[PDB]
Amino acid sequence: RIPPELNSSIKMDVGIEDCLHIEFEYSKSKYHLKDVIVGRIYFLLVRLKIKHMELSIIRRETTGVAPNQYNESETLVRFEIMDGSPSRGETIPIRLFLGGFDLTPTFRDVNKKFSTRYYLSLVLIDEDARRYFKQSEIILYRQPPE
Amino acid sequence: ARPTFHITVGDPHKVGDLATSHIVYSVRTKTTSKAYKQPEFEVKRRYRDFLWLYNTLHSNNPGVVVPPPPEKQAVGRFESNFVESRRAALEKMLNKIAAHPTLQLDADLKLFLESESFNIDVKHKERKENKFVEQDDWFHDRRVYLDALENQLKALLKAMDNMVAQRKAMAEAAADFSASLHALSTVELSPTLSGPLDALSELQLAIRDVYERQAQQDVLTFGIIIEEYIRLIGSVKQAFSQRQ
Amino acid sequence: HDRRVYLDALENQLKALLKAMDNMVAQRKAMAEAAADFSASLHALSTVELSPT
Amino acid sequence: ARPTFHITVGDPHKVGDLATSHIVYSVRTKTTSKAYKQPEFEVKRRYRDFLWL
Amino acid sequence: LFEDMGRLLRSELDRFEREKVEDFKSGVETFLESAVEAQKELIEKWETFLMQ
C-alpha cells in the first residue's frame, strides 16, 4: 500500500479527575512496518506519585462472526518512556522504532472471518503499583518499495 | 547464652497415620548457651516426650513458671498446621524457657535437646536411677476474667470461622453470577451484548473474588492471632495449676 | 419453537439466579450475627479492664 | 505459555500415619499458560491421583 | 518461691497484655491493606471494563 491520502496525528487530553490530567500526541494514525512513533506526553495536573511510564504495542487477533468472537491478545513491546515523578508543564518525548518488533500489517475483516489489529497502550504506574492506561488503535501497513 | 540459645524445630518426621500418630521433629539446638552442652545438637523428639518434658519443667520448677507445651491435639487433628502449632508451641515454649535461664536449666532438658533418646531415659538417668487472701483474691479475680475473656475469644474465634466459611455463596453466588451472566450471554450471540453479559460474568466474580478473598485476607489473620493468646492463656491456666 | 425453547432455558436459569439471590441475602447473616457478637466480645472486656489506654 | 506454566507444589497435608498414608499437596498452578484455564488454581492432590494421572 | 512466681508472673503479665495489642495491630494491618487493595481490585476491574 502507497502513502495514505489522510494521515492525521493522534492527539488527546485524558485523565483521572482531580488526580492526573495529561495530553498525549502521536505523529500519525498510520505507520508503515519500519516507521517510527514520534510523540510526546504533556502533564497538565499531577497529584499522584508516578514511578514510571511505558508505551506498549498490543496485537489483537479477532476470529469469528457476530457473538462468535474470540479475541487473542499479545503484548509485543513494553517501552519505558519516563523514569520518575514529573510535575505540571513537563513534556516527555517519545521515539519508538517499529523495526525492532517485526509486526504484521493491520488486517481488517479478511474474507469476513478475522481481523488483526494494533494498539498503542500508554501505561503509567504509581509508587503503590497502581496502573493508569489509555489505548489507541494504530494502522500498520506494508510499504511498497520504489 | 540463656536467651542466646538457638532452636530450630524442623524435620517433620511425621510418623504416618494411626489416627493419633506423633510427629517427630528435629530439635536442633544450635546454642551458644553455656546452659547447653552441645553448640549444636539435634534430637528427634516426639510429641509425647515433650509434653512430659514440659511437665518436667513444670515439676522441677516449683511455681517457677512453665509456660504452655507443644501443641494439643485436643482440637488439633494431626494437621501440618496443627503439628506446626505443636512445633511452634514447642518452639515458643522452648524459646521462652531458654530466655528464662531456670527452665532452660532443667537437666533433663539439656539431655533432651542435646541427646535423642527421649525425655524418659534421660529422666531415669538424671536422678541416678500480700497474705493468702489478696492473692487468692487476685487469682480468682484474675482467673475469672481470663476465663471470661477466653470465652469471648472463642466466641470471637468462632466468629472468624463464620466469616471465612461464609466466604460461601458469596463465592458461589458471584461465581455463578458470573456464570449466569455468562449463561445468557452465551445465548445471546448478539455479540456485543454477549460480551458485556459475559463481562458481567467476569466482574461478579471478580468482585466475588475480592469478597471471597477477604476472609483469608483478614479474618484468618485474626483467627490466628486470637488463637494464640488463647494458647497462652491455656498454658497459664496450667501455670496456675502448678502454682496450686 | 426456537423462541419457546430459549426462554424456557432462560426461565430455568432465572429460577436458579432467583434462588442465587436468596442465598446471597442468607449469606449476609453471620456476617451479621458474627459481627454483632464480635462487637460485644470486644466491648465486654473494655468495661471490665481498668487500664484506660 | 506452555512452558510458561507456574507450579508450586506445597502444603504437605501429609495425612498422618496409616503406614501408607498419602500426602496431599497443594498444587498451585499459577499459570499464564493458555493451556490452563485458571491463572491460578490450587488443587490438593493426593498421591494416588497423580500416579494415575 | 511460690511468691516469686507471682511476681514474675506479673512481670510477664505486663508483658503479655502489652504484647497483645501489637499482634492485632499487625492483624489490623492485614485487614487494612486487604481492604484498600480490594477497592483497588475493583479499580482494575473497572479499568478494564472501561476498556470494554
Coordinates of C-alpha atoms in Angstrom, one line a residue:
Chain A
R1 CA 0.0 0.0 0.0
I2 CA 1.2 3.5 -1.0
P3 CA 1.3 6.5 1.5
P4 CA -2.3 7.3 2.7
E5 CA -4.2 10.4 1.5
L6 CA -5.0 11.3 5.0
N7 CA -2.7 10.6 8.0
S8 CA -3.9 12.6 10.9
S9 CA -1.9 12.9 14.2
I10 CA -3.5 11.3 17.2
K11 CA -3.9 13.9 19.9
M12 CA -5.9 13.7 23.0
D13 CA -6.5 15.0 26.6
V14 CA -7.2 12.2 29.2
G15 CA -7.2 11.9 32.9
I16 CA -8.4 10.7 36.3
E17 CA -10.4 13.7 37.5
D18 CA -8.7 16.0 40.0
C19 CA -5.7 13.5 40.2
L20 CA -4.0 13.2 36.8
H21 CA -4.5 15.2 33.6
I22 CA -2.4 14.6 30.5
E23 CA -2.3 15.5 26.9
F24 CA -0.6 12.8 24.6
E25 CA 0.3 13.1 21.0
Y26 CA 1.5 10.5 18.4
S27 CA 2.6 11.9 15.0
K28 CA 0.5 9.6 12.8
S29 CA -2.6 7.3 12.8
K30 CA -1.0 5.1 10.2
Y31 CA 2.6 3.7 10.4
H32 CA 4.5 1.5 8.0
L33 CA 6.2 -1.6 9.3
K34 CA 9.6 0.1 9.6
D35 CA 8.2 3.5 10.7
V36 CA 8.8 5.5 13.9
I37 CA 6.3 6.5 16.6
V38 CA 7.3 10.1 17.3
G39 CA 5.2 11.7 20.1
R40 CA 5.0 13.5 23.3
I41 CA 3.3 13.3 26.7
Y42 CA 2.4 16.6 28.4
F43 CA 1.4 16.9 32.0
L44 CA -1.3 19.3 33.0
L45 CA -2.2 18.2 36.5
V46 CA -0.2 15.7 38.7
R47 CA -1.4 14.8 42.2
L48 CA -0.2 11.2 42.2
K49 CA 3.4 9.9 42.7
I50 CA 4.4 8.4 39.4
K51 CA 7.1 5.7 39.4
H52 CA 7.4 5.1 35.7
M53 CA 5.6 5.4 32.3
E54 CA 5.7 3.0 29.4
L55 CA 4.4 2.7 25.9
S56 CA 3.1 -0.7 24.7
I57 CA 2.2 -2.1 21.3
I58 CA -0.6 -4.6 21.7
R59 CA -1.6 -7.0 19.0
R60 CA -5.2 -8.3 18.9
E61 CA -6.3 -11.2 16.7
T62 CA -10.1 -11.3 16.4
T63 CA -11.7 -14.5 15.0
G64 CA -15.3 -15.4 14.1
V65 CA -18.6 -13.8 13.2
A66 CA -21.1 -11.9 15.4
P67 CA -21.4 -13.2 19.1
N68 CA -19.0 -16.0 18.0
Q69 CA -16.0 -13.8 18.6
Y70 CA -12.7 -15.0 20.1
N71 CA -10.0 -12.3 20.8
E72 CA -6.4 -13.3 21.3
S73 CA -4.2 -10.5 22.8
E74 CA -0.4 -10.3 22.7
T75 CA 1.9 -7.6 24.1
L76 CA 4.7 -7.1 21.6
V77 CA 6.7 -4.3 23.3
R78 CA 7.0 -2.7 26.7
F79 CA 8.9 0.5 26.1
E80 CA 9.7 2.7 29.1
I81 CA 9.4 6.4 28.2
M82 CA 9.7 8.0 31.7
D83 CA 11.5 7.2 34.9
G84 CA 10.3 9.2 38.0
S85 CA 7.7 11.8 39.0
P86 CA 7.1 14.8 36.7
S87 CA 5.2 18.0 37.7
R88 CA 2.8 20.1 35.7
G89 CA 4.1 21.7 32.4
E90 CA 6.6 18.8 31.9
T91 CA 7.0 17.4 28.4
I92 CA 8.2 13.8 27.8
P93 CA 9.4 12.9 24.2
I94 CA 8.6 9.5 22.6
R95 CA 10.6 7.9 19.9
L96 CA 9.7 4.3 19.3
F97 CA 11.2 2.4 16.3
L98 CA 8.8 -0.3 14.9
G99 CA 11.7 -2.1 13.1
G100 CA 12.7 -3.7 16.4
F101 CA 9.5 -5.7 16.8
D102 CA 8.7 -7.4 13.3
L103 CA 4.9 -6.6 13.3
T104 CA 2.4 -7.9 10.7
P105 CA 0.2 -5.3 8.9
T106 CA -3.3 -4.4 10.1
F107 CA -5.8 -6.8 8.6
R108 CA -9.4 -5.8 8.7
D109 CA -12.4 -8.2 8.2
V110 CA -10.4 -10.6 5.9
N111 CA -12.9 -12.6 3.9
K112 CA -15.3 -11.7 6.8
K113 CA -13.6 -14.2 9.1
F114 CA -10.8 -12.4 11.0
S115 CA -9.1 -9.2 12.0
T116 CA -5.5 -8.5 13.2
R117 CA -5.3 -5.1 14.9
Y118 CA -2.6 -3.0 16.6
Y119 CA -3.0 -0.7 19.6
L120 CA -0.7 1.8 21.3
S121 CA -1.3 1.4 25.1
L122 CA 0.2 4.1 27.3
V123 CA 0.6 2.9 30.9
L124 CA 1.6 5.0 34.0
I125 CA 2.5 3.2 37.2
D126 CA 2.3 4.9 40.7
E127 CA 4.6 4.2 43.7
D128 CA 2.0 1.8 45.3
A129 CA 1.8 -0.1 41.9
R130 CA -1.5 1.4 40.7
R131 CA -1.8 1.5 36.9
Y132 CA -3.4 4.1 34.7
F133 CA -3.8 3.5 31.0
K134 CA -5.1 4.7 27.6
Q135 CA -5.4 2.5 24.5
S136 CA -5.4 3.9 20.9
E137 CA -5.7 2.0 17.6
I138 CA -2.9 2.4 15.0
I139 CA -3.0 1.1 11.5
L140 CA 0.1 -0.8 10.4
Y141 CA 0.8 -1.2 6.6
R142 CA 3.3 -2.7 4.3
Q143 CA 5.2 0.0 2.3
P144 CA 5.6 -0.7 -1.5
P145 CA 9.3 -0.4 -2.3
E146 CA 10.1 2.1 -5.1
Chain B
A1 CA 23.7 -17.5 76.5
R2 CA 20.4 -18.2 78.3
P3 CA 18.3 -16.3 75.8
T4 CA 21.2 -17.0 73.4
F5 CA 20.1 -20.4 72.8
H6 CA 19.2 -21.1 69.1
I7 CA 16.5 -23.6 68.2
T8 CA 15.1 -24.9 65.0
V9 CA 12.4 -27.4 65.3
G10 CA 12.1 -28.9 61.9
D11 CA 12.0 -32.1 60.1
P12 CA 8.5 -33.1 60.4
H13 CA 9.1 -36.8 60.6
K14 CA 5.5 -37.1 60.9
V15 CA 5.0 -40.6 61.6
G16 CA 2.3 -41.5 59.0
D17 CA -1.3 -42.3 60.0
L18 CA -2.5 -44.2 63.1
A19 CA -5.2 -41.6 63.9
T20 CA -3.0 -40.4 66.8
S21 CA 0.5 -40.6 65.2
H22 CA 3.2 -38.5 66.5
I23 CA 5.4 -36.2 64.7
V24 CA 9.0 -36.3 65.5
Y25 CA 10.8 -33.2 64.9
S26 CA 14.4 -32.5 64.8
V27 CA 15.1 -30.2 67.6
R28 CA 18.2 -28.6 66.7
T29 CA 19.6 -26.6 69.4
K30 CA 22.4 -24.6 68.0
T31 CA 23.2 -22.9 71.1
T32 CA 25.9 -20.7 72.2
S33 CA 24.3 -21.1 75.6
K34 CA 26.6 -22.4 78.2
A35 CA 23.3 -23.9 79.6
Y36 CA 23.5 -26.3 76.7
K37 CA 26.4 -28.7 76.3
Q38 CA 26.5 -29.1 72.6
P39 CA 26.9 -26.0 70.4
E40 CA 24.6 -28.0 68.2
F41 CA 22.6 -31.0 69.0
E42 CA 19.8 -32.5 67.3
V43 CA 17.3 -34.7 68.9
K44 CA 14.2 -36.0 67.3
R45 CA 11.6 -35.7 69.7
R46 CA 8.1 -36.9 69.6
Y47 CA 5.2 -35.2 70.9
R48 CA 4.8 -37.3 74.0
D49 CA 8.3 -36.7 75.1
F50 CA 7.9 -33.0 75.0
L51 CA 4.6 -32.9 76.8
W52 CA 6.1 -34.9 79.5
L53 CA 9.1 -32.7 79.3
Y54 CA 7.1 -29.7 79.5
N55 CA 5.5 -31.2 82.6
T56 CA 9.0 -31.9 83.8
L57 CA 9.8 -28.3 83.6
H58 CA 6.7 -27.9 85.5
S59 CA 7.9 -30.4 88.0
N60 CA 11.4 -29.0 88.6
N61 CA 10.4 -25.5 88.9
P62 CA 8.0 -25.3 91.9
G63 CA 5.9 -22.3 91.0
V64 CA 8.7 -21.1 88.9
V65 CA 6.9 -21.0 85.6
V66 CA 6.3 -23.3 82.8
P67 CA 4.7 -21.6 80.0
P68 CA 2.1 -23.5 77.5
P69 CA 3.5 -27.0 75.9
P70 CA 3.9 -28.5 72.4
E71 CA 0.5 -28.1 70.7
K72 CA -2.6 -30.1 71.7
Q73 CA -4.4 -32.4 69.6
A74 CA -7.4 -31.7 71.9
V75 CA -8.7 -29.7 69.0
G76 CA -5.7 -30.5 66.7
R77 CA -6.0 -33.3 64.2
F78 CA -2.7 -34.2 63.0
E79 CA -2.7 -31.3 60.5
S80 CA 0.6 -30.0 59.2
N81 CA -0.6 -26.8 60.7
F82 CA -1.5 -28.5 64.0
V83 CA 1.8 -30.2 64.1
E84 CA 3.2 -26.9 63.2
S85 CA 1.4 -25.5 66.0
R86 CA 3.0 -28.1 68.1
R87 CA 6.3 -27.4 66.6
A88 CA 5.7 -23.8 67.2
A89 CA 4.3 -24.4 70.6
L90 CA 7.3 -26.0 71.5
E91 CA 9.4 -23.5 69.8
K92 CA 7.8 -20.9 71.8
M93 CA 7.7 -22.8 74.9
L94 CA 11.3 -23.6 74.4
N95 CA 12.2 -20.2 73.2
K96 CA 11.0 -18.6 76.3
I97 CA 12.2 -21.0 78.6
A98 CA 15.5 -20.7 77.1
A99 CA 15.3 -17.0 77.6
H100 CA 14.5 -17.7 81.1
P101 CA 17.6 -19.0 82.5
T102 CA 15.9 -21.5 85.0
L103 CA 13.6 -23.6 82.9
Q104 CA 16.5 -23.7 80.5
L105 CA 18.5 -25.3 83.3
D106 CA 16.4 -28.4 83.6
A107 CA 19.0 -31.1 83.1
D108 CA 16.5 -33.4 81.6
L109 CA 16.0 -30.7 79.1
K110 CA 19.7 -30.4 78.4
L111 CA 19.9 -34.0 77.8
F112 CA 16.6 -34.0 76.0
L113 CA 17.6 -31.3 73.5
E114 CA 21.1 -32.4 73.4
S115 CA 20.5 -36.1 73.1
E116 CA 17.9 -38.0 71.1
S117 CA 16.5 -40.8 73.2
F118 CA 13.5 -39.0 74.6
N119 CA 12.8 -37.4 77.9
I120 CA 12.3 -40.7 79.6
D121 CA 15.6 -42.4 79.6
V122 CA 17.2 -39.1 80.4
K123 CA 14.9 -38.8 83.3
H124 CA 16.0 -42.0 84.8
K125 CA 19.5 -41.3 84.2
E126 CA 19.4 -38.0 85.9
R127 CA 18.2 -38.9 89.4
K128 CA 20.8 -41.5 89.2
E129 CA 18.2 -44.1 88.6
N130 CA 0.2 -9.9 100.2
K131 CA -1.1 -12.6 102.6
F132 CA -3.1 -15.7 101.3
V133 CA -6.3 -13.8 100.8
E134 CA -5.5 -10.9 98.4
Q135 CA -3.5 -13.2 96.3
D136 CA -6.2 -15.7 96.3
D137 CA -8.5 -12.9 95.5
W138 CA -6.3 -11.8 92.9
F139 CA -6.0 -15.1 91.5
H140 CA -9.5 -15.7 91.4
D141 CA -10.2 -12.2 90.1
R142 CA -7.7 -12.8 87.6
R143 CA -8.8 -16.0 86.7
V144 CA -12.3 -15.3 86.4
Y145 CA -11.7 -12.6 84.0
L146 CA -9.5 -14.6 81.9
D147 CA -11.8 -17.4 81.7
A148 CA -14.4 -15.0 80.6
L149 CA -12.2 -13.3 78.2
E150 CA -11.2 -16.6 76.8
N151 CA -14.7 -17.3 76.2
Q152 CA -15.1 -14.3 74.3
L153 CA -12.0 -15.2 72.5
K154 CA -13.6 -18.4 71.5
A155 CA -16.7 -16.6 70.5
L156 CA -14.7 -14.2 68.5
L157 CA -12.7 -17.0 67.2
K158 CA -15.9 -18.7 66.2
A159 CA -16.8 -15.5 64.6
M160 CA -13.7 -16.0 62.4
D161 CA -14.8 -19.2 61.3
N162 CA -18.1 -18.0 60.2
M163 CA -16.8 -15.4 58.1
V164 CA -14.5 -17.5 56.3
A165 CA -17.0 -20.2 55.9
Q166 CA -19.3 -17.7 54.7
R167 CA -16.9 -16.8 52.0
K168 CA -19.5 -19.1 50.9
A169 CA -22.1 -18.1 48.2
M170 CA -20.7 -15.1 48.0
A171 CA -18.4 -17.1 46.2
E172 CA -20.8 -19.2 44.5
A173 CA -23.2 -16.6 44.2
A174 CA -20.9 -14.3 42.3
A175 CA -19.2 -17.2 40.8
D176 CA -22.3 -18.3 39.4
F177 CA -23.3 -14.9 38.8
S178 CA -20.6 -14.8 36.6
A179 CA -21.6 -17.9 35.0
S180 CA -25.2 -16.9 35.0
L181 CA -24.3 -13.8 33.4
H182 CA -22.4 -15.6 31.1
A183 CA -25.2 -18.0 30.6
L184 CA -27.5 -15.8 28.8
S185 CA -24.7 -14.1 27.3
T186 CA -23.9 -17.1 25.5
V187 CA -27.4 -17.4 24.4
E188 CA -27.1 -14.0 23.2
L189 CA -24.9 -14.3 20.2
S190 CA -25.6 -10.7 19.6
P191 CA -22.1 -10.3 20.0
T192 CA -21.8 -7.0 21.6
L193 CA -24.4 -8.0 24.1
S194 CA -22.8 -11.3 24.6
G195 CA -19.6 -9.7 25.5
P196 CA -20.9 -7.4 28.1
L197 CA -23.1 -10.0 29.6
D198 CA -20.2 -12.2 29.9
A199 CA -18.3 -9.1 31.0
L200 CA -20.7 -9.1 33.7
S201 CA -19.7 -12.5 34.3
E202 CA -16.2 -11.6 34.9
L203 CA -17.0 -8.9 37.1
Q204 CA -19.2 -10.6 39.5
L205 CA -16.9 -13.0 40.0
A206 CA -14.0 -10.6 40.2
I207 CA -15.7 -8.9 42.8
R208 CA -16.9 -12.1 44.2
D209 CA -13.5 -13.0 44.4
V210 CA -12.5 -10.0 46.1
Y211 CA -15.2 -10.6 48.6
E212 CA -14.2 -14.2 48.8
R213 CA -10.8 -13.1 49.3
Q214 CA -11.3 -11.3 52.3
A215 CA -11.6 -13.9 54.9
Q216 CA -8.4 -15.2 54.0
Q217 CA -7.0 -11.8 54.0
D218 CA -8.1 -10.6 57.2
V219 CA -10.3 -12.9 59.1
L220 CA -7.9 -15.6 59.1
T221 CA -5.2 -13.3 60.4
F222 CA -7.2 -12.6 63.3
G223 CA -8.3 -16.1 63.9
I224 CA -4.8 -17.0 64.3
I225 CA -3.7 -14.3 66.5
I226 CA -6.8 -14.8 68.7
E227 CA -5.9 -18.3 68.9
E228 CA -2.5 -17.5 70.0
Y229 CA -3.5 -15.8 73.0
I230 CA -5.8 -18.4 73.9
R231 CA -2.8 -20.7 73.7
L232 CA -1.0 -18.7 76.2
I233 CA -4.0 -18.5 78.3
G234 CA -4.4 -22.2 78.3
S235 CA -0.9 -22.5 79.3
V236 CA -1.0 -20.0 82.0
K237 CA -4.0 -21.8 83.2
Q238 CA -1.7 -24.6 83.7
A239 CA 0.7 -22.2 85.2
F240 CA -1.7 -21.5 87.8
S241 CA -2.4 -25.1 88.4
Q242 CA 1.2 -25.7 89.1
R243 CA 1.1 -22.9 91.5
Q244 CA -1.7 -24.5 93.3
Chain C
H1 CA -40.2 -23.3 18.8
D2 CA -36.7 -21.7 18.9
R3 CA -38.2 -18.9 20.9
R4 CA -40.0 -21.2 23.3
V5 CA -37.1 -23.3 24.0
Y6 CA -34.6 -20.4 24.6
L7 CA -36.8 -18.6 27.0
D8 CA -37.7 -21.9 28.6
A9 CA -33.9 -22.5 29.2
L10 CA -33.5 -18.9 30.3
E11 CA -36.5 -19.3 32.7
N12 CA -34.9 -22.3 34.4
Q13 CA -31.7 -20.1 34.6
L14 CA -33.8 -17.2 36.0
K15 CA -35.2 -19.6 38.6
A16 CA -31.6 -20.6 39.5
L17 CA -30.5 -16.9 39.5
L18 CA -33.5 -16.1 41.8
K19 CA -32.6 -18.7 44.3
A20 CA -29.0 -17.4 44.0
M21 CA -30.2 -14.0 45.3
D22 CA -32.0 -15.8 48.2
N23 CA -28.7 -17.4 49.1
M24 CA -26.9 -14.1 48.9
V25 CA -29.3 -12.4 51.4
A26 CA -28.9 -15.5 53.7
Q27 CA -25.2 -15.3 53.2
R28 CA -25.2 -11.8 54.6
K29 CA -26.2 -13.4 58.0
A30 CA -23.3 -14.1 60.2
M31 CA -21.6 -11.8 58.9
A32 CA -24.2 -10.0 60.7
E33 CA -24.7 -12.2 63.8
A34 CA -20.9 -12.7 63.8
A35 CA -20.0 -9.1 63.8
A36 CA -22.7 -8.3 66.2
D37 CA -21.3 -10.7 68.8
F38 CA -17.6 -9.8 67.6
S39 CA -18.6 -6.1 68.8
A40 CA -20.0 -7.4 72.0
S41 CA -16.9 -9.5 72.5
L42 CA -14.5 -6.6 72.2
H43 CA -16.9 -4.3 74.2
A44 CA -17.3 -6.6 77.0
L45 CA -13.7 -6.6 78.1
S46 CA -13.4 -2.9 77.6
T47 CA -15.8 -2.3 80.5
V48 CA -14.1 -4.8 82.9
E49 CA -10.5 -3.8 82.2
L50 CA -9.4 -0.8 84.1
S51 CA -6.4 0.2 82.0
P52 CA -7.7 3.2 80.0
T53 CA -5.2 3.0 77.1
Chain D
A1 CA 2.5 -20.2 27.9
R2 CA 3.2 -23.9 27.5
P3 CA 6.5 -23.8 29.4
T4 CA 5.1 -20.6 30.9
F5 CA 3.0 -22.5 33.4
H6 CA 4.0 -21.8 37.0
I7 CA 3.7 -24.6 39.6
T8 CA 4.2 -24.7 43.3
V9 CA 3.5 -28.0 44.9
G10 CA 3.4 -27.2 48.6
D11 CA 1.3 -27.6 51.6
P12 CA 2.3 -31.0 52.7
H13 CA -1.1 -32.0 54.1
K14 CA 0.5 -35.2 54.8
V15 CA -2.2 -37.2 56.1
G16 CA -0.9 -38.6 59.3
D17 CA 0.2 -42.2 59.8
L18 CA -1.6 -45.3 58.4
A19 CA 1.8 -46.8 57.2
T20 CA 0.8 -46.0 53.6
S21 CA -0.8 -42.5 54.1
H22 CA -0.9 -40.1 51.3
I23 CA 0.3 -36.6 51.2
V24 CA -1.9 -34.2 49.7
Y25 CA -0.2 -31.2 48.3
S26 CA -1.5 -28.0 47.2
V27 CA -0.8 -27.9 43.5
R28 CA -1.0 -24.3 42.7
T29 CA -0.8 -23.7 39.2
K30 CA -0.2 -20.0 38.7
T31 CA -0.2 -20.2 35.0
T32 CA -0.1 -17.7 32.4
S33 CA -0.5 -20.7 30.2
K34 CA -3.5 -20.5 27.9
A35 CA -3.3 -24.3 28.3
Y36 CA -4.5 -23.7 31.8
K37 CA -7.9 -22.1 32.5
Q38 CA -7.2 -20.5 35.8
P39 CA -4.4 -18.0 36.1
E40 CA -4.2 -19.7 39.5
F41 CA -5.7 -22.8 40.7
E42 CA -5.0 -24.8 43.6
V43 CA -5.9 -28.4 43.9
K44 CA -4.9 -30.6 46.6
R45 CA -3.9 -33.8 45.1
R46 CA -3.1 -36.9 46.7
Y47 CA -0.5 -39.3 45.6
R48 CA -2.8 -41.8 44.1
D49 CA -4.5 -39.2 41.9
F50 CA -1.3 -38.2 40.4
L51 CA 0.1 -41.6 39.7
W52 CA -3.0 -42.3 37.9
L53 CA -2.8 -39.0 36.3
Chain E
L1 CA 9.5 -19.4 95.7
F2 CA 5.8 -19.5 95.1
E3 CA 5.8 -15.8 95.9
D4 CA 8.4 -15.0 93.4
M5 CA 6.4 -16.9 90.9
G6 CA 3.6 -14.4 91.4
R7 CA 5.9 -11.5 90.9
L8 CA 7.4 -12.9 87.9
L9 CA 4.1 -13.6 86.6
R10 CA 3.1 -10.1 87.0
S11 CA 6.2 -9.0 85.1
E12 CA 5.3 -11.3 82.5
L13 CA 1.8 -10.1 82.6
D14 CA 2.5 -6.7 81.8
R15 CA 4.5 -8.0 79.1
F16 CA 1.5 -10.1 77.8
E17 CA -1.1 -7.6 77.8
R18 CA 1.2 -5.3 76.2
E19 CA 2.0 -7.8 73.7
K20 CA -1.4 -8.2 72.9
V21 CA -2.3 -5.1 71.1
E22 CA 0.6 -5.4 68.9
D23 CA -0.3 -8.7 67.5
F24 CA -3.5 -7.4 66.3
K25 CA -2.2 -4.3 65.3
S26 CA -0.5 -6.2 62.7
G27 CA -3.6 -8.2 62.4
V28 CA -5.5 -5.0 61.8
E29 CA -3.0 -4.1 59.3
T30 CA -3.6 -7.3 57.3
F31 CA -7.0 -6.2 57.2
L32 CA -6.3 -2.7 56.3
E33 CA -4.4 -3.4 53.4
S34 CA -6.7 -6.1 52.2
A35 CA -9.5 -3.5 52.1
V36 CA -7.7 -0.7 50.3
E37 CA -6.5 -3.2 47.8
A38 CA -9.8 -4.6 47.5
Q39 CA -11.0 -1.2 46.3
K40 CA -8.1 -1.3 44.1
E41 CA -9.1 -4.7 42.8
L42 CA -12.3 -3.2 41.8
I43 CA -10.5 -0.4 40.2
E44 CA -8.6 -2.5 37.9
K45 CA -11.7 -4.4 37.2
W46 CA -13.1 -1.1 36.3
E47 CA -10.2 0.0 34.2
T48 CA -10.7 -3.0 32.0
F49 CA -14.4 -2.6 31.5
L50 CA -13.9 1.0 30.7
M51 CA -11.5 -0.6 28.2
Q52 CA -14.6 -2.5 27.3

